[PDB]
Design a binder for this molecule. Structure first.
Ligand SMILES: [Zn+2]
Ligand SMILES: [Zn+2]
Lengths: 67, 50, 151, 148, 259, 101, 115, 79
């Protein structure tokens, strides 16, 4: 759906790293490089960004029920 | 030991003897028991009706 | 739903009253899953408990008289043993003899019969664990186990 | 007082057939005076011992020279002269077996006392005249002391 | 029979985390301090949410949940606040809560990112963690024509109630880096990598056993979520535990003197 | 057990002075040796034991003695030893005729 | 629908008492302390401080059930020393120990900043 | 007049007697023992059983059709 606000295990704020992570992946940083470029050292926090899937974009593709 | 023949010696022991036994595939308990040299006391058949 | 049937269930079908089954004159309940494994590791010969760890474990005994036993080792520092505490768990004055799962067969024939190098003959005497390692064969549902004799 | 046994032993061997436990080991030791055998299980972590070492045993029914039959209860606070103050390694167990060389007619010549300290076993095997005060289901202290 | 004197020295101080060492104290005291860090330091987070309109693609409880997890900079206000259960005021007042508002509507054809910057607070000091290049916490994405309006209130609470009141991100805790007390037993000590705080040569795998040792030199690394400063988390935790023990002391003294 | 071993284990052999004096008090060894009524009763008890042995062998052609019975006699004996502090090193006090009667 | 409220773990209802004292009848100079709405955070530090007292024969703590929120502390003392004063002495030493630690910590943090 | 039944209370008889006496105590029947402040009829019934004061007799029906009447006090309580 959308990026979680906090890491489930650690509790570190990970909700503001998604847009930066995507931007770095555009620039040929690899994931192993982009993740620690953002300051995510514990693998519990790293798996959040690494395994997240963003379905909010597919939902926004549909027309709203209102206007 | 329960299929092996068990006797009692002169010193009151229970030595397990080993003797030949024959298992069959049919059942005709009467014509078998009434035969020479077959042991008529222990010969069982697994068929209750017979 | 009624007082008569309530009393009858209490006096006939309570769990503690159903420990031994008449099907095979063995106990039905037994120590199982991670207590059994933790008991075998806890009652081994080389298990020593400091004073604080013993005082915590005794805090979980319901049938304890409030008397701390004399430690098996006094002077270099006071150390208890797993057997020394499991003896406090055993109730009354129970006496039974069991063999561990890994007990070699030749051990009984030769010397060291009553002083087992492998700690593999369970001997409980006067309600106190003297020697041996408790396994499924000692606390399980087999006939003659420590719970069967206790019942 | 009360001293069930007193002698100086020498470690003739450490656990044969390998060690089965990493903290405790079995040692076989002999005697100089009484010429009797001991098999003792000891924890090496707090009291390490090596082959060929020489030590003194004092098996006693109590830790007091007064010979007052103590509680079997653990009391840390006691301002009494303890027999263990002069000793390094002190255990506490109960004798659970006494085997003999006796027969139907003649008495026992060689005795073997088995005593367990919380699961640590000891077999003391000598002549009947030395293992005299050992009685089954009795509480004893092994007081050991290593000496040069 | 008396208290021992412990000592502290800080090896790293940052706006993000404090790393320090405590000497000459019990294991239990160290563990309890580690425990109070996570559970029993008061902090401010939004707990009451009233939604006036929500045309987004996430349902009302999904947005209220995400809102709850947004950290708020509460450094000195949290001390002078009161628990909502303790305030004698009938309705929300400035002395027991902080009010937030959010009115965002997407009109242009570009996707609108509703982030924490859109939360308008009532107090100039209690604001989201993006106070002072980095982006901000993303709440929701809105398509053209969608909107959401909501009014929220922040209260004081600690971790024991809910994890949103947890001030710390990660509390690393260690003692006895080289296995001297041997509270843990390695079947093969060679395979185990050295700790950061270990002091051994490349050859030696673990320290020699000493039977007389006790756990000392506890190593802490307290990393903040951004709501409280890393250094003030520890001061608040120590004060809270001392106050907790003091309340128990008063209640026991009252009970004994009445007994 | 063997015919030689069965007899060795369950006869009351009352013709040995020292052997009997090893296990029994002094007030009882003289009674066993002197009184012939007691000796006759003991011989009769062994004859009953021999008869029971013959009956068991005909009941159980299978060698195994493992059986299922109401209350564990060996465990009760062990319990009695530990309750009364028997100390099986001194001569016994129980009169052998009290056992039979 | 059966989930208890979150604040159930630390809030006392009306009529409940924080700490209750019951004398132990099995052995002399023994006592049991029941603390409501507490967990290991408080029981463990109290027990460890008590074990330092030379005049305390026994000290232990337990939580009867994790779903319940109660602690039980058993204190046995040598006969010249009440368990109640042993408990209060442990508390008043732990408080002093924590206050000293906080003061040293704040001094160290001040010295870390340009010191 | 002659009694060939066991002199012990079977478990079933013990269960039914306790239940059916606790029911009478529930209905304001007089109590046979000096109870000590307890309020539960089952505890009171268990006390009257152990004190051997239950005013109930048991009619054991033999297979032939005859029957024997045993007072609660006349037979040994198994527990
Ligand atoms: Zn994490
Ligand atoms: Zn207010």
């Amino acid at each position: 759906m959308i990026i979680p606000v906090r890491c489930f295990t650690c509790g570190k704020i990970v909700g503001n790293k998604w847009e930066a992570y995507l931007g770095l992946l555009q620039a040929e940083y690899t994931e192993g490089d982009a993740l620690d470029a953002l300051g995510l050292k514990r693998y519990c926090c790293r798996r959040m960004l690494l395994a997240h899937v963003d379905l909010i974009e597919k939902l926004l593709n549909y027309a709203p029920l209102e206007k | 030991d329960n299929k092996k023949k068990i006797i009692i010696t002169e010193d009151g022991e229970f030595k397990a003897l080993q003797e030949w036994i024959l298992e069959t595939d049919g059942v005709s308990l009467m014509r078998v028991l009434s035969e020479k040299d077959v042991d008529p006391v222990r010969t069982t058949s697994n068929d209750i009706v017979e | 739903q009624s007082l008569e049937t309530r009393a009858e269930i209490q006096e006939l079908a309570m769990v503690p009253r159903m420990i031994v089954t008449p099907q095979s004159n063995r106990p039905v309940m037994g120590i199982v899953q991670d207590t059994l494994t933790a008991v075998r590791k806890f009652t081994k010969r080389d298990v020593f408990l400091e004073r604080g760890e013993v005082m915590n474990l005794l805090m979980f005994l319901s049938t304890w008289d409030g008397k701390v036993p004399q430690p098996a080792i006094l002077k270099p520092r006071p150390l208890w043993t797993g057997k020394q505490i499991f003896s406090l768990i055993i109730p009354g004055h129970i006496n039974c003899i069991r063999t561990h799962s890994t007990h070699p067969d030749d051990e009984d024939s030769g010397p060291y019969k009553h002083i087992s190098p492998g700690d593999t003959k369970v001997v409980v005497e006067n309600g106190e664990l003297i020697m041996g390692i408790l396994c499924k064969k000692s606390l399980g549902t087999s006939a003659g186990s420590l719970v069967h004799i206790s019942y | 007082a009360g001293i069930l046994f007193e002698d100086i032993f020498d470690v003739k061997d450490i656990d044969p057939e390998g060690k089965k436990f990493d903290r405790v080991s079995r040692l076989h030791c002999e005697s100089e005076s009484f010429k009797m055998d001991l098999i003792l299980d000891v924890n090496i972590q707090i009291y390490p011992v090596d082959l060929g070492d020489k030590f003194r045993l004092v098996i006693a029914s109590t830790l007091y020279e007064d010979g007052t039959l103590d509680d079997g209860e653990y009391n840390p606070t006691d301002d009494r002269p303890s027999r263990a103050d002069q000793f390094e390694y002190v255990m506490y167990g109960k004798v659970y077996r006494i085997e003999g060389d006796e027969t139907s007619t003649e008495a026992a010549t060689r005795l073997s006392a088995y005593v367990s300290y919380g699961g640590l076993l000891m077999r003391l095997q000598g002549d009947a005249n030395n293992l005299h005060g050992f009685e089954v289901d009795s509480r004893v202290y092994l007081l050991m002391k290593k000496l040069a | 029979p008396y208290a021992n004197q412990p000592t502290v020295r800080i090896t790293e101080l940052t706006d993000e985390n404090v790393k320090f060492i405590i000497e000459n104290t019990d294991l239990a005291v160290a563990n309890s301090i580690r425990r109070v860090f996570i559970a029993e330091v008061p902090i401010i987070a939004i707990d009451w949410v009233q939604i006036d309109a929500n045309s987004s693609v996430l349902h009302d409880e999904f947005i209220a949940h995400r809102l709850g997890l947004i950290p708020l900079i509460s450094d000195d206000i949290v001390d002078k606040l009161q628990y909502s259960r303790d305030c004698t005021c009938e309705e929300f007042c400035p002395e027991c809560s902080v009010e937030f508002t959010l009115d965002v509507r997407c009109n242009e054809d570009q996707t609108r990112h509703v982030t924490s910057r859109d939360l308008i607070s009532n107090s100039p000091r209690v604001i989201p963690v993006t106070s002072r290049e980095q982006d901000d916490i993303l709440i929701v994405k809105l398509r053209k024509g969608q909107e959401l309006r909501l009014r929220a209130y922040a209260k004081k609470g600690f971790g024991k109630e809910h994890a949103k009141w947890n001030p710390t991100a990660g509390v690393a805790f260690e003692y006895d880096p080289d296995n001297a007390l041997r509270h843990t037993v390695y079947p093969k000590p060679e395979e185990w990598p050295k700790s950061e705080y270990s002091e051994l040569d490349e050859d030696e795998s673990q320290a020699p056993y000493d039977p007389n040792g006790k756990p000392e030199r506890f190593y802490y690394n307290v990393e903040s979520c951004g709501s409280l400063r890393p250094e003030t988390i520890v001061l608040s935790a120590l004060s809270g535990l001392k106050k907790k023990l003091s309340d128990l002391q008063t209640q026991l003294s009252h009970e004994i003197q009445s007994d | 057990p063997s015919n030689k071993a069965f007899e060795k284990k369950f006869r009351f052999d009352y013709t040995n002075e020292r052997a009997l004096r090893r296990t029994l008090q002094e007030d009882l060894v003289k009674d066993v040796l002197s009184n012939a009524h007691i000796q006759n009763e003991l011989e009769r008890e062994f004859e009953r034991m021999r008869e029971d042995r013959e009956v068991l062998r005909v009941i159980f052609p299978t060698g195994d003695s493992k059986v299922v019975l109401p209350c564990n006699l060996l465990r009760m004996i062990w319990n009695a030893q530990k309750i009364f502090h028997i100390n099986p090193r001194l001569p016994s006090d129980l009169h052998p005729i009290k056992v039979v009667e | 629908m059966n989930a208890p409220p979150a604040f159930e773990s630390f809030l006392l209802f009306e009529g409940e008492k924080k700490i209750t004292i019951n004398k132990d009848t099995k052995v002399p100079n023994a006592c049991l302390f029941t603390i409501n709405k507490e967990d290991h955070t408080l029981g463990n530090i109290i027990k460890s401080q008590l074990l330092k007292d030379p005049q305390v024969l026994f000290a232990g703590y337990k939580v009867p059930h994790p779903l319940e929120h109660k602690i039980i502390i058993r204190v046995q003392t040598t006969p010249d020393y009440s368990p109640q004063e042993a408990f209060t002495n442990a508390i008043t030493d732990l408080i002093s120990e924590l206050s000293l630690l906080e003061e040293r910590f704040r001094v160290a943090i001040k010295d870390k900043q340009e010191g | 007049q002659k009694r060939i039944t066991t002199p012990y209370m079977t478990k079933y008889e013990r269960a039914r007697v306790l239940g059916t006496r606790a029911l009478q105590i529930a209905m304001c029947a007089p109590v046979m023992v000096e109870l000590e402040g307890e309020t539960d009829p089952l505890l009171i019934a268990m006390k009257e059983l152990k004190a051997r004061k239950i005013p109930i007799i048991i009619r054991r029906y033999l297979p032939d059709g005859s029957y024997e009447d045993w007072g609660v006090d006349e037979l040994i309580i198994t527990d």
